[PDB]
Amino acid sequence: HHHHPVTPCEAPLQWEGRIVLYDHNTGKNTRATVTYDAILQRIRILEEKKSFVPCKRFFEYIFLYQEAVMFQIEQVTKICSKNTLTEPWDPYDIPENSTYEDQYYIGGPGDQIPVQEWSDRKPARKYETWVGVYTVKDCYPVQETYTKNDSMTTSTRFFDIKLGISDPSVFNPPSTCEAAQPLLM
Amino acid sequence: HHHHPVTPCEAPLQWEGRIVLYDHNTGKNTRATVTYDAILQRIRILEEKKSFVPCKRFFEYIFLYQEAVMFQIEQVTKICSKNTLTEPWDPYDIPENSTYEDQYYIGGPGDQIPVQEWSDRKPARKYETWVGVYTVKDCYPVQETYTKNDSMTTSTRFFDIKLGISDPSVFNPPSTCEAAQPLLM
Ligand SMILES: [Ca+2]
Ligand SMILES: [Ca+2]
Ligand SMILES: [Cl-]
Ligand SMILES: [Cl-]
Ligand SMILES: [Cl-]
Ligand SMILES: [Cl-]
Numbered sequence: 034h035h036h037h038p039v040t041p042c043e044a045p046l047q048w049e050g051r052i053v054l055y056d057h058n059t060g061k062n063t064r065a066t067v068t069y070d071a072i073l074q075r076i077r078i079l080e081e082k083k084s085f086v087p088c089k090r091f092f093e094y095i096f097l098y099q100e101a102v103m104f105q106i107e108q109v110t111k112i113c114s115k116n117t118l119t120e121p122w123d124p125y126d127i128p129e130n131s132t133y134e135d136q137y138y139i140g141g142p143g144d145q146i147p148v149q150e151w152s153d154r155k156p157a158r159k160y161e162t163w164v165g166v167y168t169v170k171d172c173y174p175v176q177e178t179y180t181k182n183d184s185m186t187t188s189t190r191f192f193d194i195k196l197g198i199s200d201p202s203v204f205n206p207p208s209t210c211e212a213a214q215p216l217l218m
Numbered sequence: 219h220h221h222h223p224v225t226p227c228e229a230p231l232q233w234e235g236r237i238v239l240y241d242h243n244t245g246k247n248t249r250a251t252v253t254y255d256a257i258l259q260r261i262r263i264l265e266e267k268k269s270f271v272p273c274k275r276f277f278e279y280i281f282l283y284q285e286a287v288m289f290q291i292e293q294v295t296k297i298c299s300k301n302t303l304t305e306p307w308d309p310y311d312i313p314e315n316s317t318y319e320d321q322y323y324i325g326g327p328g329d330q331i332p333v334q335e336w337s338d339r340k341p342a343r344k345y346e347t348w349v350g351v352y353t354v355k356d357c358y359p360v361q362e363t364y365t366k367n368d369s370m371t372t373s374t375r376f377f378d379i380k381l382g383i384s385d386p387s388v389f390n391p392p393s394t395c396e397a398a399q400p401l402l403m
């Protein structure tokens with residue numbers, strides 16, 4: 034008998050890593066290099082081009098939540114958009130009041146890792162809007178599903194995570210962002 | 219005035235590296251990981267698959283010139299061919315009697331490398347059948363063009379070369395080569 038943990042582990046506050054964003058609404062899998070900083074509430078997201086995908090435009094996003102602004106740079110053409118942020122900062126961590134779902138091992142004999150699953154499950158709602166899988170040892174994000182705001186659901190996978198920000202230069206918006214608010218999409 | 223060098227540098231005898239084979243006769247660019255051993259006169263060549271090339275079969279070649287045999291393994295299906303070698307061993311080096319052509323730098327200010335060009339040029343023949351480019355410092359192969367045997371010409375580029383054979387296991391033919399001489403092509 035293992036004690037149901039009273040609160041979730043604390044996710045790391047700063048890291049450089051890579052994600053896949055699976056958007057169910059359009060079926061698109063966006064691959065990205067991420068710089069994540071829950072202390073200054075900024076996140077920088079660089080989309081990746083793969084061989085022979087049939088879209089031609091790739092974006093860098095710099096979310097600066099402490100200055101209420103997001104910059105979106107078309108990577109090739111360097112066209113920059115500057116937009117106001119209305120929405121609060123949302124960390125990649127387990128909220129304090131989350132429901133404990135389970136603990137299990139991912140992978141094989143010898144090469145396997147213990148992880149935990151948390152959710153926002155509560156008896157009043159049939160369906161969860163949030164599920165997070167996090168390592169037991171270091172509380173690193175592994176996967177999140179997020180059903181939020183009338184039924185736009187995303188699935189995020191996280192990998193190659195490295196504690197710390199070895200390159201803070203990425204949060205400086207480029208010279209071209211003396212700029213306006215386009216919808217680039 | 220630099221003295222015309224009396225003999226070419228001596229190419230390294232053993233290395234692991236990668237090549238591109240450009241065959242003019244068919245236009246095909248074959249990318250390969252190579253294990254090269256001029257002492258035991260063996261060479262092992264592993265073709266590389268790239269995303270969405272329209273051929274489906276990729277070969278490992280183990281040339282054992284000291285036992286007069288070559289093994290060709292279809293990589294996925296592991297079908298093995300065992301063939302006799304009639305042809306003598308040919309090293310990746312500059313033959314002793316080669317004509318000196320030139321010395322120059324490849325690349326830019328700060329990031330540039332000095333290399334030499336040798337050939338089999340002689341006044342009796344209008345066209346060279348062999349041209350080799352080799353580093354000045356270490357005599358590493360950079361590029362060869364080979365017009366030999368009625369006008370089948372190949373161009374080879376060499377890169378990521380590492381002195382020594384850190385993995386001799388590659389010269390052991392697989393369990394499936396209790397086997398016969400197919401033409402796989
Ligand atoms: Ca969150
Ligand atoms: Ca040769
Ligand atoms: Cl790719
Ligand atoms: Cl790739
Ligand atoms: Cl590829
Ligand atoms: Cl690739």
Ligand SMILES: [Ir+4]
Nearest residue numbers: 083084268269
């Ligand atoms: Ir690729």
